[model samples]
Target chain A: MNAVEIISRDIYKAIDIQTKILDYMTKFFTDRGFKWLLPIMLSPITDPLWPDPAGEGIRPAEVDVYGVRMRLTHSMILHKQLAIAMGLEKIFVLSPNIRLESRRKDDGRHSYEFTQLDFEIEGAKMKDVMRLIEELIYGLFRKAEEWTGREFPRARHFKVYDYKDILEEFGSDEKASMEMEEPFWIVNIPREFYDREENGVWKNYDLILPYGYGEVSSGGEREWEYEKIVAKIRAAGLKEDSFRPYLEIARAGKLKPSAGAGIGVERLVRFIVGAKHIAEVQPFPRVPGIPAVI
Target chain B: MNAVEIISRDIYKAIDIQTKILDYMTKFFTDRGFKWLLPIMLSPITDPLWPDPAGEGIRPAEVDVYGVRMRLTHSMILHKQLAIAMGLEKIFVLSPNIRLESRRKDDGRHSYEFTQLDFEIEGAKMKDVMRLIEELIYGLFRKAEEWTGREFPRARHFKVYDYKDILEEFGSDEKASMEMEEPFWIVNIPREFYDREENGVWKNYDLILPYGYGEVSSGGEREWEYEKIVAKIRAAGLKEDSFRPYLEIARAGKLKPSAGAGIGVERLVRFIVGAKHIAEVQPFPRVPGIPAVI
Candidate 1:
């Protein structure tokens, strides 16, 4: 039998691990003095993730609620930045993220519906947040191994790679990940304009999972200045109507420079439990083109 | 400015209390051996709330994903019942509840988007879940007052009223609430075929907020027998197709008697903070008929 098939047979055992992960995360952040913020599942303004390179079959899910066209939060990146602006120095939340990855449903790594632990630290740099994540992920798997009594790949220290350079040597991040037995960071992703750009390079990072689990965590320093945000949007050949409210907040100088990342809880648990399908860890699996009745 | 206007001015304080409530709730259930289950935002099946007396202009939301029609979860009632069958004795989650209260947007007590503390206990009865909610609501307000330094409407003891009898004497639950200074339970609501009933009386209850805030909490013992489920649905003229899967589970004899309730977090916080509108406590307010960009 396959890994998820075996795991799915014992639904009780299947559920406990996911719960413990959530419980551990709650304590992990609170113990570190991070304040918890309730997530906004549907927001008027959220991360468009426009110009995302891997966004071919992926689109933001939209729902009409009370005559207003609301977009489901793919990630709470914009809200996290706005919260830091509101003077919350450090914040975290376990929130829902719905991305319509229609083409990648059978890839075993994609689920249209998933939960993520998203956090942001106001005034924190990329290096500071990087250390926080390394500690968080490394510590999480240690607990997972002990609790589940399962052998998982061990990591001593995570290696870092520049995205542009990795492409030349390894062909792609996917191939680069296949060569490593430990989680690693891929920096300078040329995805979105919201991330800070330094000397003509984007300053964002993605933590690619080892053992072909793909990217499980991503975020970086944000563009806080209004003029840069406007310039970036216009320069990208994107429409401003979608980000009108975000621009308004930026124009008022309330948007703060913050660094953070979103760790996919399903993907993380799926890896730790040796489940091949991301839907194996999800409660109501929303795999692309799959119909689930409750 | 009115109450919510004044409260919304301090987005920081607004966020902190909601966070505290969530934190307190997690601990509250975990202390009592309730395992936390992650919420599912969308499913093929959910509570239809059809034939609801207060359900005029209210309808279930439909979304198309991957060419499949999916319904947003109005409540996780079916999944909770399934969880009990999966061997979880007690489970809890802070789940999103999207009720399309299209006609009630301006009523000040409604929101198109909201969160609720939903829970179910295997083999639990109506009174068991009822007392649990009483203790929960009472304890929550105590903490709210201690944390916020605000004098909320204190309840010495919550009184119970039968829905049918209350309508005859006090005209309606709305009137019954406004006449009281503290919260009270209104039982025997004649709605939905899923609720347990006896002698033509439903075994459900709704906790009405005093001073005209309206109903903020609801649920009761569920009907588990397949024959009764089929009979009730037919009697109510609900489509058998909509409940095909739920009936299948029932016919297998795996479905068990359970009791639970869902307490609206936004409404509860609004009452504690004395916000005039439910949207005040909401992040990206989805008031009926009003368009929100996020």
Candidate 2:
């Protein structure tokens, strides 16, 4: 089940647990100098708030980062999406279990729609960035454990390798196959592959890691040069009108040389609260094709 | 400025103030023994956390309200909204001011969009409900004064006579003109008659009070009866698709009697912060026709 339906349970305890967890999350943001953002319940009409109806990609009803407009998102549901679109290199940390590789077609281990704890630190190398993520993650885990009065299972982090390279090194199908997973990012793709096209071959870059769902963090160093950005836009077959102004901002070189990541909120909540199912995290359950819980 | 603009200045401070205020508002709910509803975010898409191809009515992308459908969200912002639609009368308080109503025709003292500290108490009478609203309004103002080291402005609620009522009360242009100058909610709207040649008159329901714009708290004893609800649906010219389930739920007798009132968030913020212009209260100045701050 997706997040929408899970939180709507008869068991008040189940709901209470998640609320407690969120309270901690709020504190986590507060401790880090990030203030809590409240919900605007009056109207739900904004571009960044949702996808674009025009299929012109996800244009936020409101303004976008750098004062540009696009349908990208106000949240990070996609992987290294911002970085890949911007052609920037970044470090992303992943949870132990995931959905994309766990079940479904070609999914080996996890579910497709899972939770994530994504973050980005600007002007930082992968090594330093990874440490920060580690600190934050560990701190959160410890805090969760303290609140629950339970010991958390140990966690380990691993660096990923390219599929071809991993297979050659391991010389074992299972180990090599798993290790040679998807790349974190596929950049400079040719025009025909904006949306997920099952099999449209194009110029794509990958920072492969042997984890669930191929490259959980698909990001790379951004291409800031104006000519390169313009060429990439044309090459990617995106509308000039749609991304023209955003490209102009990129060309201006004001974007911080930042490494960004997208973390699935449901997955993060599930992991922290020790909930086995993703549905348990949501108050309402509306998955793909279901639309409404009722 | 519509909610679509990026805020300048201390984004963190703005967030902190709003969250703190809402957290404080919970006191009123708890004091009255109403269940303290947690904050919820909603998405208007099949996959909520993911971008919705449709739109978010007022929600930002970063927000995730549990128990809500993912669509353009013209319906309900969250599950509680559904609860409200189903006769529960859920009230969502917004910190950010919505679009400016002054840009729109016939707006009262408050702008089209403003910050509102709102709530819905089940099974409340209008008189009692009004008293509760007074407490909240004064409570928040007092809180703000304490926090900012300022004296809270005393509000003197006033009443305005309806156009026809003035005609009946004074029977003279000069005498009635002076008495009609006050804020009040004109109740029992006569069925609108657009024809210029017709009598174009309707009787009043004999209800008048100090209202901000028209009837800021224009709630009457809720119509728990199914036929009354249906009649109300037609009376208000609301789309059946949006309110059909509510009528059905009312028919089921599952809906408890309830009453609610929503105050303008921006107006309240302006009143509390001593902001002369509604735009001053909004982090992003939302002047009508101009969605974003220049």
DockQ of each: 0.40, 0.09
Put down candidate 1 lDDT per residue, A96-142, tens digits, no spaces.
87777655446777777777799999888888888888888888888
- Tens digits of per-residue lDDT for model 2 on A1-294? 322223224433343444444344444444554322222322222112112111223233332312323231233322223322333223222221111111122222123233333444445444454444445455656776776787653333534344344446764323442543322323333221222212332222323233332333332233345565555456655455544434444455534444433434444555555554544554443233233333
Q: Residues B1-294, candidate 1, lDDT per residue (tens digit)?
A: 321222225566666777777777887888898878878777667887865666762556878876667777778887788777666889898888777776544688887677778899988988888888888888888898899887766665788988887899889877887898889998888777778988988888898998889899899898889898888778877778776666777777878888998888878778877788887765556676666554
lDDT of 2 by residue, B98-212 (tens): 3222244322233333343445555565556556665665577678877767775345443434546555776632343234443333433333111001133322212222222
Give the top-scoring candidate (TM-score): 1
Candidate 2 chain A lowest-lDDT run of ten: A94-103
Q: State fnat for each of the candidate structures.
A: 0.38, 0.06
Residue B166's lDDT within candidate 1 is 84
Worst 10 residues of 1 chain A by lDDT: A1-10
Q: What lDDT score is found at residue B190 in candidate 2? A: 36
